[PDB]
Design an enzyme around this catalytic site. Sequence first.
Site, PDB file in Angstrom:
ATOM      1  N   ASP A 163      12.516  20.032  56.207  1.00  0.00           N
ATOM      2  CA  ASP A 163      13.216  20.300  57.451  1.00  0.00           C
ATOM      3  C   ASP A 163      13.018  21.749  57.892  1.00  0.00           C
ATOM      4  OD1 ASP A 163      15.732  20.363  59.380  1.00  0.00           O
ATOM      5  OD2 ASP A 163      15.495  18.276  58.749  1.00  0.00           O
ATOM      6  N   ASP A 164      14.061  22.363  58.453  1.00  0.00           N
ATOM      7  CA  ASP A 164      13.918  23.710  59.000  1.00  0.00           C
ATOM      8  C   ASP A 164      14.448  24.775  58.049  1.00  0.00           C
ATOM      9  OD1 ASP A 164      16.682  23.437  59.222  1.00  0.00           O
ATOM     10  OD2 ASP A 164      16.700  23.357  61.412  1.00  0.00           O
TER      11      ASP A 164
ATOM     12  N   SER B 276      14.257  14.089  58.112  1.00  0.00           N
ATOM     13  CA  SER B 276      14.988  13.794  59.340  1.00  0.00           C
ATOM     14  C   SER B 276      14.283  14.399  60.545  1.00  0.00           C
ATOM     15  CB  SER B 276      16.420  14.302  59.232  1.00  0.00           C
ATOM     16  OG  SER B 276      17.133  13.504  58.302  1.00  0.00           O
TER      17      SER B 276
ATOM     18  N   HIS C  85      19.821  22.611  60.858  1.00  0.00           N
ATOM     19  CA  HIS C  85      19.615  21.173  60.709  1.00  0.00           C
ATOM     20  C   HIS C  85      19.370  20.755  59.260  1.00  0.00           C
ATOM     21  CE1 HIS C  85      17.231  17.364  61.193  1.00  0.00           C
ATOM     22  NE2 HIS C  85      18.151  17.120  62.102  1.00  0.00           N
TER      23      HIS C  85
ATOM     24  N   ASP D 242      37.848  17.907  46.781  1.00  0.00           N
ATOM     25  CA  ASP D 242      37.397  18.801  47.859  1.00  0.00           C
ATOM     26  C   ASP D 242      38.199  18.612  49.145  1.00  0.00           C
ATOM     27  OD1 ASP D 242      35.248  17.900  45.951  1.00  0.00           O
ATOM     28  OD2 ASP D 242      34.262  19.672  46.803  1.00  0.00           O
TER      29      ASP D 242
ATOM     30  N   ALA E 101      14.154   9.082  58.594  1.00  0.00           N
ATOM     31  CA  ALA E 101      15.099   8.738  59.648  1.00  0.00           C
ATOM     32  C   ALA E 101      14.338   7.998  60.736  1.00  0.00           C
ATOM     33  CB  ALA E 101      15.782  10.001  60.202  1.00  0.00           C
TER      34      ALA E 101
ATOM     35  N   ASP F  37      28.638  25.516  48.989  1.00  0.00           N
ATOM     36  CA  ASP F  37      28.659  24.134  48.528  1.00  0.00           C
ATOM     37  C   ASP F  37      27.265  23.604  48.166  1.00  0.00           C
ATOM     38  OD1 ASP F  37      30.829  22.552  47.853  1.00  0.00           O
ATOM     39  OD2 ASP F  37      30.655  21.259  49.622  1.00  0.00           O
TER      40      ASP F  37
ATOM     41  N   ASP G 100       8.552  27.358  51.416  1.00  0.00           N
ATOM     42  CA  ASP G 100       8.535  27.693  52.832  1.00  0.00           C
ATOM     43  C   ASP G 100       7.103  27.606  53.326  1.00  0.00           C
ATOM     44  OD1 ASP G 100       8.469  28.856  55.378  1.00  0.00           O
ATOM     45  OD2 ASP G 100       9.729  30.556  54.845  1.00  0.00           O
TER      46      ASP G 100
ATOM     47  N   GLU H 207      16.986   3.407  67.480  1.00  0.00           N
ATOM     48  CA  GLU H 207      15.745   2.729  67.852  1.00  0.00           C
ATOM     49  C   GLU H 207      15.616   1.437  67.071  1.00  0.00           C
ATOM     50  OE1 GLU H 207      13.333   6.971  68.142  1.00  0.00           O
ATOM     51  OE2 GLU H 207      12.140   5.115  68.062  1.00  0.00           O
TER      52      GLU H 207
ATOM     53  N   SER I 101      19.422  11.822  62.185  1.00  0.00           N
ATOM     54  CA  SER I 101      19.294  12.862  61.166  1.00  0.00           C
ATOM     55  C   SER I 101      20.258  12.708  60.007  1.00  0.00           C
ATOM     56  CB  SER I 101      19.508  14.250  61.779  1.00  0.00           C
ATOM     57  OG  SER I 101      18.434  14.602  62.629  1.00  0.00           O
TER      58      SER I 101
HETATM   59 CA   LIG Z   1      10.961   7.261  68.017  1.00  0.00          CA
HETATM   60 CA   LIG Z   2      10.757  32.211  53.537  1.00  0.00          CA
HETATM   61 CA   LIG Z   3      32.396  20.731  47.860  1.00  0.00          CA
END
Ligand SMILES: [Ca+2]
Ligand SMILES: [Ca+2]
Ligand SMILES: [Ca+2]
Length: 473
Positions: free
Chosen positions: A45-46, A145, A86, A7, A184, A54, A66, A223, A260
């Site tokens: 996550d989001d 994360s 993210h 790659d 995380a 990829d 979702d 932290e 993250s």
């Molecule tokens: Ca903290």
């Molecule tokens: Ca959706």
């Molecule tokens: Ca790749």
Amino acid sequence: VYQEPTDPKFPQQWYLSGVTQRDLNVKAAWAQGYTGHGIVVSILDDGIEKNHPDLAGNYDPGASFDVNDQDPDPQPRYTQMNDNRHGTRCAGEVAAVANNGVCGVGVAYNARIGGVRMLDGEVTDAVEARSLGLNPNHIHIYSASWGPEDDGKTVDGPARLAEEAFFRGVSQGRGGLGSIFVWASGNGGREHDSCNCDGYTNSIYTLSISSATQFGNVPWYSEACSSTLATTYSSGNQNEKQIVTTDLRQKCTESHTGTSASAPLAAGIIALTLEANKNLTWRDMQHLVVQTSKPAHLNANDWATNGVGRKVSHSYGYGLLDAGAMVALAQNWTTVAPQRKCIIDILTEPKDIGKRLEVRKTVTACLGEPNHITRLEHAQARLTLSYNRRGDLAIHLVSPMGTRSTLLAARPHDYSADGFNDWAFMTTHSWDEDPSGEWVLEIENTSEANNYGTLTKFTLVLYGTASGSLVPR
Ligand SMILES: [Ca+2]
Ligand SMILES: [Ca+2]
Ligand SMILES: [Ca+2]
Ligand SMILES: [Cl-]
Ligand code: NA
Ligand code: NA
Ligand code: NA
Ligand code: NA
């Protein structure tokens, strides 16, 4: 022999392999035949760009949902600011496709990857629980994360539904072997935050992962706390390289950063490890991490040797993950004995804190009982106390083997007068120690102010077993 990925950005993935020894030794695991085949990882996550060039080849709708919009499709919501990039960045770290002329590769580039869209909206207790408890007999490993605000004054953790999701996960998830939750540890370094004030990272059910810079230093955002287990590479200053991964809008990025980026790399390494031994329990996995992680060439001012000869730091836990060593040790691993829990209520009366309080207690660790522990895993000091300014407190716990765990360091921004309400401060630093003997709790006022409060409960909770020890390091 083994041919490494071709790659275009794989040579930029300095943390995966190199001549220089500053890496996670992932190629060595690939060379042993482990690339994540058959393992399922979900990014909480989001959202995840499931059609990313990829990610598409490894995408698994069974590992996805979702929860924000209540539908099966975790596609990110596209905005001018690209706020929802993210999760896609995190997913590529785990399972970006290899040898396809696009971007780089995931740590576990043949694993299946999914995402739960749950951060793009109000993140309630129910939202977290439904994410943590998604398809727990299909998904092997969950990567998170995210967490409570890193303002350095918050004390917060899973509420009831989320905590129940953790216990259901580790008990009945993965055919009873237990869901693997990777967390995380946080981005609150600048605010002098402590990851022990975060119930997600502080949980025994999560593997909390911290970060190191390319040159082997503690990043600005890091932290420190005793609940951290281990470390993977992430970003640092602008002369240090960063993390290479899949980006929103089918792009590639070389500038993924912060806490993250560390958890997904750990999740990928854990995927390789599960491929090497599918029978590993959630506790097995934490034992492997403790035994194989590497302190060497990580700079910290607080490295200490624990009771069984292992180096441990509040910035790094047991050190950098070593994928090669993980997959090797996993193959002939003997399943740990069932988890015992020894509850010891320490106080006979409340104790005024004042300038300094020291509580000493000699324990037998449930001698003569089914919960007798001679091999410690996690230890908790569950504390209830009042105090006029919480952030002035520093709290230490010393094991019978002499291992000093910082349960709480000073937090200058924490002005709270709410104290701690049975908060379960956790340490991983006495792992495999015999917990029989004298424990010492220290609570001190780190400021010149005339502060006041009272410790009204101290439960020492010991987790572990009574068999199977190795000769100390
Ligand atoms: Ca903290
Ligand atoms: Ca959706
Ligand atoms: Ca790749
Ligand atoms: Cl428990
Ligand atoms: Na809370
Ligand atoms: Na079980
Ligand atoms: Na944890
Ligand atoms: Na002892």
